[PDB]
Design a protein around this ligand. Structure first.
Ligand SMILES: NC(=O)c1ccc[n+]([C@@H]2O[C@H](COP(=O)([O-])OP(=O)(O)OC[C@H]3O[C@@H](n4cnc5c(N)ncnc54)[C@H](O)[C@@H]3O)[C@@H](O)[C@H]2O)c1
Ligand SMILES: NC(=O)c1ccc[n+]([C@@H]2O[C@H](COP(=O)([O-])OP(=O)(O)OC[C@H]3O[C@@H](n4cnc5c(N)ncnc54)[C@H](O)[C@@H]3O)[C@@H](O)[C@H]2O)c1
Ligand SMILES: NC(=O)c1ccc[n+]([C@@H]2O[C@H](COP(=O)([O-])OP(=O)(O)OC[C@H]3O[C@@H](n4cnc5c(N)ncnc54)[C@H](O)[C@@H]3O)[C@@H](O)[C@H]2O)c1
Ligand SMILES: NC(=O)c1ccc[n+]([C@@H]2O[C@H](COP(=O)([O-])OP(=O)(O)OC[C@H]3O[C@@H](n4cnc5c(N)ncnc54)[C@H](O)[C@@H]3O)[C@@H](O)[C@H]2O)c1
Ligand SMILES: [Mg+2]
Ligand SMILES: [Mg+2]
Ligand SMILES: [Mg+2]
Ligand SMILES: [Mg+2]
Lengths: 338, 22, 338, 338, 338, 22
C-alpha cells in the first residue's frame, strides 16, 4: 500500500515539496499524512496557499482547523514540537519523514525520528557525517533498500552533478571549479544581524554575499571518481528564487563549444531526460520559475579554450526543481521499500 | 493556546515572533 | 559624574545608538560601558564597524576580544544572557539601560533590569501598560526624574507627533488618519515563513506588506489633548531604511496649503529646530539616510481640501533619526539625574 | 462583424492587453489585427511570450517573421513608425486603436490615428483636454457611440473611482485625500539619470519616490458630483507590479468601520461585482498579481474616526487589472458600435 | 597650464568622474570647464548633488543657473546638443573631452569632438575599432602622446587586467575564463521592454541577466601576450552598484592557494599599490562602495586544484573605482601632453 | 525653453521624458 509520509519543517522546501506532491498525487506511492512545524495548522495552511514565489495554489482548496490542514479533502494531521523525539510517528504510522527543518542533518539528529517511530528519514540537505547521499539521475539507482537515513544533497549539487556526470563520461573531468550565483535563502538576514557566518549576517536583498558551498565536493559523493577534484563557492544575490551554476572544467579529451553542447543536448534527450534540459533561448532567471529539471543548460554561454578548459552555465529553480527531486527520491524509496 | 503561541511566549525574540510597531 | 549606560540588544537600534553616541561622545553626559546581546563581542564588533546602511565606521578603531568591544581604546564590557534578571548591572555600576531587544517593553519585563541592579531603563519602543512615554521636542520636558522606566515611543510616533503638535496648535486637530510607507524591518521574514502575524510572514523585499500599528494612537500619549483622535496603519515596502508618514487631518480653523507649509517652516526655524526640518526640494528616500531630524516635511506634497482637510507628508530615517532621539532622551535624563 | 483593433505601443499595457484578449478571444467582438511599435516583430513576439511578471505564455504558440506576430495561427501585422499619421490604418481596415504609447494622450495627438484612417481611439491613460473619460463600472454606460476619442483613465483612477462611488452613495463624500503606494513603472529611471521630473530621475528600485498625480482629481470626471472634491499623491516603491490606494474621506453620514466594510461588501456582491472585490484575508501585494478586479478592498484596514473621517485601503494589479478594464471598455464600444 | 576638460554625457560615469575630480582638485593638472548633456544645468546640478549611490555631495556647495553648474565657486559652462559636431569646443578652448555618453565609442563618433575643436578624446568605455586602449597600472605608461582618441576600457577590464598581469608574470597564464556577477547598469530596462539584447530587455531589478562581455578579450588589448587566451560572460544581478569578477585560470607553473594569495598581496603592496587591494576580511558588496582600487582581491575565496587550475575573486566599485581610473588616465595624458 | 525641454517635445517617449500618471 501507500508509504505514509510526514514532513518535518514546513518551510520553503517543506511547502514546495507538499505542492509538488499535490500535483503528482494521482500516480504516487506516497501519502502525506502528517506535518510537524514551528507554526500551527492555520498559519501553515495560509502559507501553503499564499506563496510569494509560487502564487496562489489553484489545483485544490486549502483550509485548516486546530488539528489538520486540508488539501482537496485530504486531511493532514499537524503537530508543533521542536524536539523530534516527542513526535507521534508511531501513533500516526509514519513510514518516511521528509526532514526539511535544516537542523537535523546528522545521523544523531535525524535518528530522533526513528526513535519516535518512523522507519526512514530523507534529509532535504547534505547530510552531516556518514549519510548515504543521492542525486536523482546520477546515482539514485544505487539506493540500498536497507538504509534508514538518506540525503538528497543540496539544490546546487542537484544542478551541477548531472552536468558533471555527462561531461566526465564524454571528456574526462580532471579538475573543476564552480561558482553558483544563487538566490538568497532563509538562512540569511533581512537586515544586518548576528549570524555564525559573518557574510550571511549582512542584509540579503542589498548585497552580493559570498559564502562557502560544499556542493562541489559533494559531487564527489555521487560521482565517486571525482572525489577531491572539484571545488567552488556561492555568491548569494538579491533574487528570492532561481539560481545559476557556472562550472569551469579541466578535461582530458580536447573539445570545442559546439561539441560540448551537442553532448549535453544528446544526454538531455536520452539518459538525462527530465533531469537536464537543453536550451538555446535567451532567457533570464524569472523564466525558470517552476522548471522541473535539475539543470537547464544555457547553451549560448558555453565556451572552450585551448581544447581542455570548458565553461558551462546551468539554471535551476532551487526551491521547486529541488523539491521535485526530493519527491522523485521519496517515490524511488517507496518503490524499493524494505 | 497553541504550541506556536507558547513558543512565542518562550522565545519572543525568535524570527517567528517579532512584532516591531514601526 | 557620567551616567553609566548598558545597551540591551545590539541590533539595528542598539548599533545605530552606539554609533550616534560615538559621534557625540565629546559633549555627552553618558558613558556606554556594557552591552548584553545574544551574540559575541567579535561578531558584534564586526557588525558595528561594517554596516550595510551606515557604511564602514571610520571615526575610530573598532576591535574586540573574548570579553569586550573596543571603540577607540574605550572598552565596552560584553555579556550574553537572554534573561535580564541575570545581568551584571550592579557589578558594572549601570545607571541606565537602553532596552533595544524589542522583547522587554512591558513594565514587568523592563523591570528585570532594575532587579539586576540598573537604576533606570529607557525602552527603544512603545511601552506596554502604564509606562511614561516621551517624544523629544513634544513632551520630553515633562519627564520626571523619579521615573524608573520610560519609553521613547516608536520611530513613526517620533515623526508624526512633532508635526501633529505644530498643526494642532495652529489649526486645531479634530481627528487624523496616518499611513506610514515604511522600510522593512527585522520583524519581517526574508522569504515566506512562520510568523505570528500572517503579513510579517511574507517575503519582505518582494512585497508591499500592511501591518496594524499603534503609532498614531500613541501620539495621544505625548499630546494628551488628542487622546483617541488619531489612528493609522503601516505599509512596509522593499527599502531597507527610511520611511515616510502621510497624515490627513480634519482641522477646526480653515486653511490652505501655503499656510500649512509656512506654519511648519516657522516651527522648524524656531520651537522645533532640530526636530522638524522643512524642505521644498524634490528628493527621494535615499537622500534622507542619516538625517538627524525626527520629521522632514516634504512641502511640495502638502494639500488642503475645503479648508479643513489637510494632507502633509514627512520623511524620517527610522534607524538613525530615531536613535538620535534615543540619545537625546538619555542625555536629557542624565542632565536631570537626581 | 468583428471590430478590427490595432495596438499602438506594445509596452507593458499593450502586451498585457494583448494577453488579456488572447485569453478572452472566444467571447470577444474584437479582433486584434495590427501592432505599431518602435521595435520589430521578433523582439516583440519574444517579449509577449516571456514576461517577467506574467510568466511564460502557454495558452498558444507565439512566433514571428519580418512582418507579423503569430498567436496561435492568428496573424497580427506589424509596423514601426513613431508618427501615427503615417500608419496603415485605412489599408488594414482598422476600426479601433488602443493608444498605449503614453505619448498621444491629447486630442490633437490621438487624432493622428483618425487621420491615418482609424475610426476610433481608446487612450490607455488620462486624456489631456476635453476627452471623454470612462471607468468601467462607474460611468461606462454613459459612453456615446459617436465619440471618436476616449480615455480609460489611469490605473489608480480605476481603483479609486469604484470605491468612491460606493462610499459617496452610502455616506456622501464631502472631500477626500488619496495616496497610492504604487509599484514603479517604466517612466522612472533604473539608475539616477536625466528626467524632466526630478523625482522620476531617481533609481526606481532603490527608493520611495513621490510624484504628483491627477488620479484623484480625475475621479471627478467619472463621478461629476465630486468634481473638485478629491486630491492626492503617489509614492512609487521598489515592487515591479501591484499597487495600493489609501483613501481618507470626509463623509456626511456618520458611520463606523463595520458599516463601511459591509457597504463595500454588498456592492462587491451586486452592483460592483467583477469591479470591486471584498477581502477579509491578510494578504500582501504578490497575492494580487493577476487579479481581475479594479479594486480589492482590504477590509481589515478600514477605520473611522469621529463618525465622519473614513479610511479605506484597496489593492490593484496596475498592469493586468487595468488592461482587463481596457478590454472591457473596448468590448463595450464594440457592442454599441453604430 | 591646466588642461581644459569637457564632459560629454553627464551620467553615472560623467557625474562620478566629476565628483572624483572635485575631491582631487588641489593636485590636478585638469580643469573641468564644460559639460554637454541631454539635460539642462539645473537638472544636472541636482543630480550631481543628490546621488542615490554616493549620497549628498558634502565637500562644496553645488548650484546652477540657466548657463552653468557651480561647484564650490567653480563655474562649469553647460550646453545641451546631442550632435557633438555642433559643440562649442573651440570657443571654450577644450583640450580634452571625457566621452561618457556610451554612443560615441568609434573613431568616427569620437572624432566629432575633434571637428568641434577639442584636441583629444578619452572614451569611458571600450573603443569600437582601432582605438588605443589603456588600463592604469597595466599599460598606461605605454601612452603615446601623439594619440588623439583613447579608451579607458570597461570597469570589468580594469578589475580583471591588473589581477591577470600579476598572475601571468608569476605563473604564466595559458588560458582563462571569467564571469562577472555585476550590478545592473542604465543600459538595462527597469521593466521588460524592447532592447537589442533580448536579455538586457528584461526587468533588471527582478532578474539574473546573462550578457556578453568583451572584458576578457579586451585584457588581451592591454596585455598583448594574452590575446585570444581569455573569454567570459557577465551575470547582471539586482544590485545598483559594486560588482565581482570570478576568474579561473589555467597556469603553467604549478601552485597552491596560499602562494597565489602571497603573490597578489606582494603586488598590492608594491607594483600594484593603489590598483589592487588585498583583503582577508569577510565583507560583502556594500562594503566596497567608494573603494578607490581597481580590484579588491577577496583572499579567502582563492582556490587551486591540481597545481594548474587557479580561481581568484575580486571586487570592484564599477562606477566609482572606474571613474577614479578615468581621472588617473586623464591626469597621465595631461602630464604627457602633446 | 531649454534644449532639454525641446528634446522632450521632440522625443516624448524617450526615457528622459516619460510621465505616466499612475
Ligand atoms: N531553499 C532552498 O533553496 C533549499 C534548496 C535545497 C535544500 N534546502 C535545504 O532544505 C532545508 C530547509 O530549508 P528552507 O529554505 O525550507 O528553510 P525554512 O527556514 O524556510 O524552513 C525550515 C522550516 O522548519 C521549521 N523548523 C525549524 N526548526 C524546527 C524544529 N526543531 N522542529 C520543527 N520545525 C522546525 C521552520 O519553522 C521552517 O518552517 C535546509 O536544510 C536547507 O539547506 C533549501
Ligand atoms: N529598526 C527600526 O527602524 C526601529 C525604530 C524604532 C524602534 N525600533 C524598535 O527597537 C527594537 C529593536 O529593533 P531593531 O530593529 O534594532 O531589531 P533587531 O532585531 O535588529 O535587534 C534586536 C537585538 O536584540 C537582540 N536580542 C533579542 N532578544 C534578546 C534578549 N533576550 N537578550 C539580549 N539580546 C536580545 C537581538 O539578537 C538583536 O541583536 C524593537 O522594539 C523595534 O520596534 C526599531
Ligand atoms: N504600467 C501601468 O501600470 C499602467 C497602467 C495604466 C496605464 N498606463 C499608461 O499606459 C501607457 C503606457 O504605459 P506602459 O507602462 O505600457 O509603458 P511602456 O514604456 O512599457 O510602453 C510604451 C510602449 O510604446 C512604445 N512607443 C513609445 N512611443 C511610441 C510611438 N511614437 N510609436 C509607437 N510606439 C511607441 C514603446 O516603445 C513601448 O513599447 C502610459 O500612458 C501609462 O501611463 C500604465
Ligand atoms: N556604469 C558603469 O558601471 C560603467 C563603468 C564603466 C564604463 N561605463 C561606460 O560609460 C559610458 C556611460 O555609462 P553610464 O552608466 O554613465 O550611462 P548613463 O546612461 O548613466 O549616462 C549617459 C549620459 O549621456 C547622456 N547622453 C546620451 N546620449 C547623448 C548625446 N548624444 N549627447 C550628450 N549626452 C548624451 C545621457 O543623457 C546620460 O546623462 C558607457 O559607455 C558605459 O559603457 C559604465
Ligand atoms: Mg589546453
Ligand atoms: Mg470643509
Ligand atoms: Mg466628526
Ligand atoms: Mg594540473
Amino acid at each position: 500500500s501507500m508509504v505514509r509520509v510526514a514532513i518535518n519543517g514546513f518551510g520553503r522546501i517543506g511547502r514546495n515539496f507538499m505542492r509538488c506532491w499535490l500535483q503528482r498525487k494521482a500516480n504516487s506511492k506516497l501519502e502525506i499524512v502528517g506535518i510537524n512545524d514551528t507554526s500551527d495548522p492555520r498559519t501553515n495552511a495560509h502559507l501553503l496557499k499564499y506563496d510569494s514565489m509560487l502564487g496562489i495554489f489553484q489545483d485544490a482548496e486549502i483550509t485548516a482547523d486546530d488539528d489538520c490542514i486540508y488539501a482537496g479533502g485530504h486531511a493532514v494531521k499537524c503537530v508543533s514540537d521542536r524536539n523530534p523525539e516527542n513526535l507521534p510517528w508511531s501513533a500516526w504510522g509514519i513510514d518516511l519523514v521528509i526532514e526539511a527543518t535544516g537542523v537535523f542533518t546528522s545521523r544523531e539528529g535525524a535518528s530522533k525520528h526513528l526513535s519516535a517511530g518512523a522507519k526512514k528519514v530523507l534529509i532535504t540537505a547534505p547530510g552531516k557525517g556518514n549519510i548515504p547521499t543521492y542525486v536523482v539521475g546520477v546515482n539514485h539507482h544505487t539506493y540500498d533498500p536497507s538504509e534508514d537515513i538518506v540525503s538528497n544533497a543540496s539544490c546546487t549539487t542537484n544542478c551541477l552533478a548531472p552536468i558533471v556526470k555527462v561531461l566526465h563520461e564524454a571528456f574526462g573531468i580532471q579538475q573543476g571549479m564552480m561558482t553558483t550565483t544563487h538566490s538568497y535563502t532563509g538562512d540569511q538576514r533581512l537586515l544586518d544581524a548576528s549570524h555564525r557566518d559573518l557574510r550571511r549576517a549582512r542584509a540579503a536583498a542589498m548585497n552580493i554575499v559570498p559564502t562557502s558551498t560544499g556542493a562541489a565536493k559533494a559531487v564527489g559523493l555521487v560521482i565517486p571518481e571525482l572525489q577531491g577534484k572539484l571545488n567552488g563557492i556561492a555568491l548569494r544575490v538579491p533574487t528570492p528564487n532561481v539560481s545559476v551554476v557556472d562550472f569551469v572544467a579541466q578535461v582530458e579529451k580536447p573539445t570545442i563549444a559546439e561539441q560540448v553542447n551537442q553532448v549535453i543536448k544528446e544526454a538531455s534527450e536520452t539518459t538525462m531526460k527530465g533531469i537536464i534540459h537543453y536550451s538555446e533561448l535567451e532567457l533570464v532567471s524569472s523564466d525558470y520559475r517552476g522548471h522541473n529539471a535539475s539543470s537547464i543548460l544555457d547553451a549560448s554561454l558555453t565556451m572552450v579554450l585551448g581544447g581542455n578548459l570548458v565553461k558551462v552555465v546551468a539554471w535551476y529553480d532551487n526551491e521547486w526543481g529541488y523539491s521535485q527531486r526530493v519527491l522523485d527520491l521519496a517515490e524511488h524509496m517507496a518503490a524499493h521499500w524494505a | 493556546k497553541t504550541s506556536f503561541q507558547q513558543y512565542c511566549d518562550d522565545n519572543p525574540d525568535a524570527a517567528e515572533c517579532r512584532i516591531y510597531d514601526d
